[PDB]
Amino acid sequence: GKETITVMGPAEDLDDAQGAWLKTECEAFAKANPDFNIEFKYVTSSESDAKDVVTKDPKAAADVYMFANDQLEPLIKANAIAKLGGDTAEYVKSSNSEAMAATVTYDGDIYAVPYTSNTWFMYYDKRVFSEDDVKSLDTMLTKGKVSFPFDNGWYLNAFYAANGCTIFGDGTDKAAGYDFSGDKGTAVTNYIVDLFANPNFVMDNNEGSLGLAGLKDGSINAYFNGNWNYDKVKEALGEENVGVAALPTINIGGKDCQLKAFLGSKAIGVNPNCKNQEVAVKLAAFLGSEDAQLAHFKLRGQAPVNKDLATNEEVAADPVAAAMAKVSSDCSVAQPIIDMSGYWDAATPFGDAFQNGAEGQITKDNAAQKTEDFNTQLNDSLK
Numbered sequence: 532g533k534e535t536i537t538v539m540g541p542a543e544d545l546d547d548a549q550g551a552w553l554k555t556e557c558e559a560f561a562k563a564n565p566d567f568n569i570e571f572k573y574v575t576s577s578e579s580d581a582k583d584v585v586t587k588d589p590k591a592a593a594d595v596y597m598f599a600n601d602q603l604e605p606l607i608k609a610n611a612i613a614k615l616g617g618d619t620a621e622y623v624k625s626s627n628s629e630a631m632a633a634t635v636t637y638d639g640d641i642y643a644v645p646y647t648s649n650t651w652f653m654y655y656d657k658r659v660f661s662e663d664d665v666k667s668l669d670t671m672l673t674k675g676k677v678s679f680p681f682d683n684g685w686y687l688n689a690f691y692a693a694n695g696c697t698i699f700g701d702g703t704d705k706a707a708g709y710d711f712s713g714d715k716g717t718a719v720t721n722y723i724v725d726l727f728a729n730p731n732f733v734m735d736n737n738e739g740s741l742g743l744a745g746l747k748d749g750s751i752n753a754y755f756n757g758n759w760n761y762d763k764v765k766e767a768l769g770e771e772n773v774g775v776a777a778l779p780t781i782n783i784g785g786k787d788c789q790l791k792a793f794l795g796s797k798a799i800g801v802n803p804n805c806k807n808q809e810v811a812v813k814l815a816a817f818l819g820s821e822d823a824q825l826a827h828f829k830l831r832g833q834a835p836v837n838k839d840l841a842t843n844e845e846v847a848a849d850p851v852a853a854a855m856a857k858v859s860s861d862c863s864v865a866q867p868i869i870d871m872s873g874y875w876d877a878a879t880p881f882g883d884a885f886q887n888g889a890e891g892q893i894t895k896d897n898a899a900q901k902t903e904d905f906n907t908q909l910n911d912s913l914k
């Protein structure tokens with residue numbers, strides 16, 4: 532009598548056309564562990580949605596699931612993710628950088644197995660921009676069409692971080708709260724107002740389907756997005772036209788300021804409600820193993836986090852893995868694991884309010900007001 536293990540991950544990992552990585556690796560796990568009598572059932576869900584899916588009812592959720600690490604604290608508070616020990620915890624510490632192990636560490640305990648870094652970067656049309664052009668957003672706007680998903684807080688912050696706005700201090704001090712206040716914040720809001728007023732800027736939609744469509748028809752030539760859409764970007768542009776870069780500067784008041792993406796991880800978590808914790812924990816370890824990460828790279832081009840794969844020649848030569856590494860070293864801030872729910876929620880209507888014709892449109896005349904309103908809402912969400 533087989534036991535059913537229910538595993539949740541994104542559509543791309545369950546798509547046979549992309550090698551169905553998650554199924555492939557679950558089957559490899561079973562073959563490696565003949566003492567287990569198991570079969571698999573799969574739930575399709577983006578890592579970006581795992582908080583909502585699992586915390587609503589953990590007992591109803593998958594046994595093993597793929598999530599984005601900023602969801603860690605709400606998963607813990609919902610009793611929805613198991614502490615990991617033993618060889619699994621040791622692997623997470625030994626095989627990752629300190630920053631990557633920290634992405635899944637809460638109060639000194641490991642709660643998940645990283646399988647890739649989680650950040651974003653620039654895709655661009657090499658027929659439109661040069662390598663030098665894409666160093667500066669301002670230069671780019673003089674040459675071609677630029678998009679950005681401003682109603683997605685995971686992207687929005689890069690602009691505010693560029694001018695010294697902070698989330699929980701360095702990201703780890705809850706008592707510091709949010710600081711988007713003052714002239715430093717208004718200057719960024721003003722830059723974004725000017726960006727929306729630029730006829731070569733096109734706002735991307737929240738999950739980036741607009742940008743992808745624009746790359747294809749030529750109405751957008753630069754796309755800020757991530758590794759998961761690498762194959763779709765190659766389809767849209769044609770592979771010989773795909774440029775991949777780290778983040779540009781923006782010129783605020785004559786000063787070049789560096790856009791800084793969040794850098795976290797995507798990881799495999801174990802549901803405490805799973806009836807076979809031994810199997811679930813070993814499966815999580817397997818899905819984040821070196822072999823499994825290499826397969827993720829070969830099957831659908833996802834960059835590994837395991838540092839022993841950093842010296843793989845194919846990985847080192849890959850333009851997305853390279854850009855992600857550059858974003859890590861030069862263009863990022865560590866993703867807070869202090870819950871940012873209030874920020875994700877507030878960011879979306881704030882970003883939407885830059886649009887021409889929007890209700891309560893953010894303009895030069897009200898930029899300071901709207902900036903303080905945002906800062907106030909963020910800090911109110913902590914009370």
Ligand SMILES: OC[C@H]1O[C@H](O[C@H]2[C@H](O)[C@@H](O)[C@@H](O[C@H]3[C@H](O)[C@@H](O)[C@@H](O)O[C@@H]3CO)O[C@@H]2CO)[C@H](O)[C@@H](O)[C@@H]1O
Nearest residue numbers: 541577578579599601602649683684685737738759875
């Ligand atoms: O927008 C708020 C949202 O921001 C974060 O979500 C981002 C993910 O962390 C990031 O990995 C990426 O999600 C993609 C998956 O990685 C990918 O496998 C596939 O499923 O597409 C997803 C994008 O559609 O982008 C999202 C932001 O769009 C944060 O983790 C969330 O908790 C937060 O709600």
